[PDB]
Amino acid sequence: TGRPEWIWLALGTALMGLGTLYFLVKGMGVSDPDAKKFYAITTLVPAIAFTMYLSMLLGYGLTMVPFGGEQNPIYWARYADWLFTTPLLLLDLALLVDADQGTILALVGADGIMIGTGLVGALTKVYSYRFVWWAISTAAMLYILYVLFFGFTSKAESMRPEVASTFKVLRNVTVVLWSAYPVVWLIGSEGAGIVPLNIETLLFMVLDVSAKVGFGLILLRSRAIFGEAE
Amino acid sequence: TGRPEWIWLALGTALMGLGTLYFLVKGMGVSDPDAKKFYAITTLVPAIAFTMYLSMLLGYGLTMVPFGGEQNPIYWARYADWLFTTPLLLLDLALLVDADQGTILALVGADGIMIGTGLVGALTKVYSYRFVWWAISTAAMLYILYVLFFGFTSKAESMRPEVASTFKVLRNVTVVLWSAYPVVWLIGSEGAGIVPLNIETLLFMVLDVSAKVGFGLILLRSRAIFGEAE
Amino acid sequence: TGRPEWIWLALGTALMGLGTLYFLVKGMGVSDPDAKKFYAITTLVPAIAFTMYLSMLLGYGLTMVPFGGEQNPIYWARYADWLFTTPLLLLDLALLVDADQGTILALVGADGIMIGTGLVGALTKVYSYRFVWWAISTAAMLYILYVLFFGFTSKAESMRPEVASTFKVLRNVTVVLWSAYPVVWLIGSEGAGIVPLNIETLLFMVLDVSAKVGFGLILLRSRAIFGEAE
Numbered sequence A, B, C: 001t002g003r004p005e006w007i008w009l010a011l012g013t014a015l016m017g018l019g020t021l022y023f024l025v026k027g028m029g030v031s032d033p034d035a036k037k038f039y040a041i042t043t044l045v046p047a048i049a050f051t052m053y054l055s056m057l058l059g060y061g062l063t064m065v066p067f068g069g070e071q072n073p074i075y076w077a078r079y080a081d082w083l084f085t086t087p088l089l090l091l092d093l094a095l096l097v098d099a100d101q102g103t104i105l106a107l108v109g110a111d112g113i114m115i116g117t118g119l120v121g122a123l124t125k126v127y128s129y130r131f132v133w134w135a136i137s138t139a140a141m142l143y144i145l146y147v148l149f150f151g152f153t154s155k156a157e158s159m160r161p162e163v164a165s166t167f168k169v170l171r172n173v174t175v176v177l178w179s180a181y182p183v184v185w186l187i188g189s190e191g192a193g194i195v196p197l198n199i200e201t202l203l204f205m206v207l208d209v210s211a212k213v214g215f216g217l218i219l220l221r222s223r224a225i226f227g228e229a230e
């Protein structure tokens, strides 16, 4: 394939596929209805990402957008991936602390705005406008992280000790992990164009694998996903 | 900007943004889980509309459709906005009367058909076919309003007095408000072409602000959104 | 209309419309909240299919895709139809056996992958890649059917006798019905090109009517949809 970033797309596809298979096997026989929910959510995430990375690898999840007087390749499939995987990851965190339905709707709604406006910015042909959308997208991200930090941390400390501790780790990972995305966008070819596309693709692949496989390995090795029973 | 309707798009963007901020502040500190749901729903609505109005203002939410032997500008972002905000508004009404899950699925499903077929009609290149889709869309709207009037009014009179009264007002507003949309479509440039695009845009902006901010001001000033407690 | 398959599109539109009307009338007056859910789900299915078949009939739900050195007409509206109707049909089956929330999320998620990857394969311009997507789509289908057969059959035998029997019939129909779809795709013009488009359209219309009207007639004539009451 005549795209230098192909190597990072192939590696990402393989790792998401292997992650999906592992979770699928690990989840066999689990009957606790609570654990079944976490396994369903956490296995679906890398299965979706697998299909999206494959679509980028084969060239389908790519388009050309003119801005800055040039044809810029844009992997729109990245955003389709995040559109579906980020709300599932939020659902994992919300179920852990038994968040109320009102707060879940707020987080998922803000997440849709986050990804939707990011996509609009990626496809926008007026260069200066691209960063208006980036700003709105990042504001929605900060609202999410505010809720996860100050909204959820209070509900967790009153819960089981294994629920409060697992959430604390997954929360710190999320804040650091989520916050890198808008930075890579700003410095890569969709934004300021300081880092070339092949390195931009590597950085998003490292982040995506950490979030869609790494995060799941941490959650599914915790005792919190099971109900307290004899 | 070289579009005469730009003024109405700028005004709509500003009003949705101001409405979102107001609701966001008003909702701070609210802890009653019932009120949290209404604030989550009712704040998300104008935040979505804000992004959609901005996308029309900057030119992204617009396309050209040939029919009647002319290039007709179509603001497809209007429909993307309604696709997400009208089911949230229905959820507000359904939660108020504690509607059963079966009736909610019917309303949301009929609402998706309503907006989906309206979009198809807006993008249809055969002029006469456009009104076939308008007719199907309007039939789905009448089903919704039938349920809100005859379906829900019975469940409300048995509920708390502040729930029955709030719903009655929001119901009358909804019937009048919702019914104007297909009329403006039919008379504006998407339909018969009697009213020019700049006035059509003004009329939809007046309606959208009434529905996405106005409606919310009425709901969130009612006692019905809180649980009965000491 | 200058497309020989138009006759099968017109017939499909009519049958979905008639099916929608029948279910709509049959459901009048039903007040049992459990039966209301099944009627809501089962009436929405053919109403969606009606709009999609109409969009194919009028030419809107069609596009041209170059592969094998030819312009191949692709009815993308088929996939939009299935995207919404197949998860509703799964919800019908899941509610019948009172499946847990974890298993429902798994089935609906796998169903979205099934249809999404099928659509990608239909729109893919590299001929050999089309069948890669077909393979992934079919694997997701087999996971669904595995769960319906081995996952759900165990939960049903412990339920009411009228619930276990109704599900058994709807399960056998589903396995045979669902499995024909990937076969028709492979042999028709989207795949190997052995069967011409007009016969391919007939076969999918026969299948769609069986699934979106036939299946519903079986379910809504069963006692299982009502709660056990005096």
Ligand SMILES: CCCCCCCC/C=C/CCCCCCCC(=O)OC[C@H](O)CO
Binding pocket: A199, A206
């Ligand atoms: C988890 C255990 C494994 C840890 C692994 C962490 C890797 C994550 C970071 C990678 C960035 C790599 C940056 C590579 C930069 C190459 C770009 C380049 O060639 O820049 C020179 C240019 O030609 C002229 O300026």
Ligand SMILES: CCCCCCCC/C=C/CCCCCCCC(=O)OC[C@H](O)CO
Binding pocket: B199, B206
């Ligand atoms: C809430 C408090 C404020 C209430 C505000 C309510 C406004 C809503 C209606 C506006 C329609 C305005 C119609 C303006 C018509 C102008 C079109 C025009 O110029 O038509 C003449 C044409 O050039 C030759 O026929």
Ligand SMILES: CCCCCCCC/C=C/CCCCCCCC(=O)OC[C@H](O)CO
Binding pocket: C199, C206
């Ligand atoms: C439910 C009660 C009614 C049951 C009804 C079941 C119909 C389902 C199957 C139809 C396939 C029809 C196949 C028709 C084949 C025609 C194609 C043709 O013309 O092939 C010859 C070709 O020209 C040179 O090989």
Ligand SMILES: CCCCCCCC/C=C\CCCCCCCC(=O)OC[C@H](O)CO
Binding pocket: A102, A103, A104, A106, A109, A110, A113, A136, A139, A140, A143, B016, B017, B018, B020, B021, B023, B024, B027, B030, B035, B036, B037, B039, B040, B041, B043, B044, B047, B050
């Ligand atoms: C000029 C201003 C323009 C408008 C601002 C930018 C809009 C997009 C950014 C962020 C989304 C904000 C969050 C949207 C969801 C709010 C939900 C909410 O208020 O939830 C309360 C509930 O009590 C919780 O549990």
Ligand SMILES: CCCCCCCC/C=C\CCCCCCCC(=O)OC[C@H](O)CO
Binding pocket: A105, A108, A109, A112, A113, A115, A116, A117, A119, A120, A123, B048, B051, B063, B080, B084
């Ligand atoms: C509880 C549920 C809450 C759900 C909240 C969802 C909020 C989504 C809002 C805005 C993003 C809209 C993004 C739309 C991008 C479409 C781009 C597109 O397809 O454009 C066609 C073509 O490329 C160019 O005309």
Ligand SMILES: CCCCCCCC/C=C\CCCCCCCC(=O)OC[C@H](O)CO
Binding pocket: A138, A179, A182, A183, A186, A192, A194
């Ligand atoms: C809490 C998480 C927050 C996450 C969000 C943080 C956003 C701000 C970060 C960096 C912007 C730094 C400025 C980047 C713009 C540089 C523009 C430019 O011209 O760069 C030239 C280049 O440095 C040589 O060629």
Ligand SMILES: CCCCCCCC/C=C\CCCCCCCC(=O)OC[C@H](O)CO
Binding pocket: B102, B103, B104, B106, B109, B110, B113, B136, B139, B140, B143, C016, C017, C018, C020, C021, C023, C024, C027, C030, C035, C036, C037, C039, C040, C041, C043, C044, C047, C050
């Ligand atoms: C020729 C006829 C063509 C077909 C007709 C036009 C289809 C589109 C129009 C309206 C949607 C109708 C409503 C769809 C949802 C029905 C849900 C239902 O029946 O709900 C029963 C439940 O008991 C309630 O609580």
Ligand SMILES: CCCCCCCC/C=C\CCCCCCCC(=O)OC[C@H](O)CO
Binding pocket: B105, B108, B109, B112, B113, B115, B116, B117, B119, B120, B123, C048, C051, C063, C080, C084
């Ligand atoms: C419980 C959930 C119930 C959900 C019920 C949902 C019903 C939606 C049905 C029909 C509208 C379909 C509209 C599809 C419009 C797509 C147009 C498009 O993108 O066309 C591409 C291009 O512009 C031209 O080929």
Ligand SMILES: CCCCCCCC/C=C\CCCCCCCC(=O)OC[C@H](O)CO
Binding pocket: B138, B179, B182, B183, B186, B192, B194
């Ligand atoms: C309950 C809510 C129901 C809401 C839905 C109501 C729909 C019917 C309303 C108006 C149609 C009136 C006819 C409009 C068509 C006029 C066509 C035409 O040629 O108009 C010429 C013009 O008047 C001079 O140039």
Ligand SMILES: CCCCCCCC/C=C\CCCCCCCC(=O)OC[C@H](O)CO
Binding pocket: A016, A017, A018, A020, A021, A023, A024, A027, A030, A035, A036, A037, A039, A040, A041, A043, A044, A047, A050, C102, C103, C104, C106, C109, C110, C113, C136, C139, C140, C143
């Ligand atoms: C190389 C391998 C590539 C990756 C494989 C192909 C991916 C797409 C195919 C099938 C989806 C599989 C099902 C996805 C959903 C799994 C849900 C789950 O594990 O559910 C457990 C729960 O306990 C249940 O009740």
Ligand SMILES: CCCCCCCC/C=C\CCCCCCCC(=O)OC[C@H](O)CO
Binding pocket: A048, A051, A063, A080, A084, C105, C108, C109, C112, C113, C115, C116, C117, C119, C120, C123
């Ligand atoms: C609990 C919820 C779980 C939800 C699980 C959903 C999984 C969907 C995954 C992959 C399919 C993606 C298909 C995307 C197809 C878009 C094609 C398109 O519009 O392409 C534009 C143009 O035609 C060419 O660039």
Ligand SMILES: CCCCCCCC/C=C\CCCCCCCC(=O)OC[C@H](O)CO
Binding pocket: C138, C179, C182, C183, C186, C192, C194
């Ligand atoms: C449980 C449900 C499973 C459902 C999924 C079953 C998939 C496999 C079925 C058939 C493939 C048979 C081979 C088809 C490929 C034929 C290619 C070819 O060249 O055919 C030439 C033609 O026969 C003369 O011209």
Ligand SMILES: *C\C=C(C)/C=C/C=C(C)/C=C/C1=C(C)CCCC1(C)C
Binding pocket: A082, A085, A086, A089, A114, A115, A117, A118, A119, A133, A134, A137, A138, A141, A177, A178, A179, A181, A182, A185, A208, A211, A212
């Ligand atoms: C795949 C898993 C995760 C957690 C992915 C998260 C992605 C983001 C947080 C992306 C955020 C963006 C922002 C905030 C600005 C516009 C561009 C992005 C969509 C990359």
Ligand SMILES: *C\C=C(C)/C=C/C=C(C)/C=C/C1=C(C)CCCC1(C)C
Binding pocket: B082, B085, B086, B089, B114, B115, B117, B118, B119, B133, B134, B137, B138, B141, B177, B178, B179, B181, B182, B185, B208, B211, B212
């Ligand atoms: C933004 C809030 C509301 C309540 C918007 C409602 C929009 C409609 C009811 C639109 C209905 C249409 C019909 C009935 C006919 C096809 C064209 C429309 C989509 C405008």
Ligand SMILES: *C\C=C(C)/C=C/C=C(C)/C=C/C1=C(C)CCCC1(C)C
Binding pocket: C082, C085, C086, C089, C114, C115, C117, C118, C119, C133, C134, C137, C138, C141, C177, C178, C179, C181, C182, C185, C208, C211, C212
């Ligand atoms: C309308 C109701 C049903 C049950 C439709 C089901 C459709 C499928 C099971 C289609 C499956 C496909 C596969 C498995 C392979 C790719 C192509 C298809 C989408 C046709």
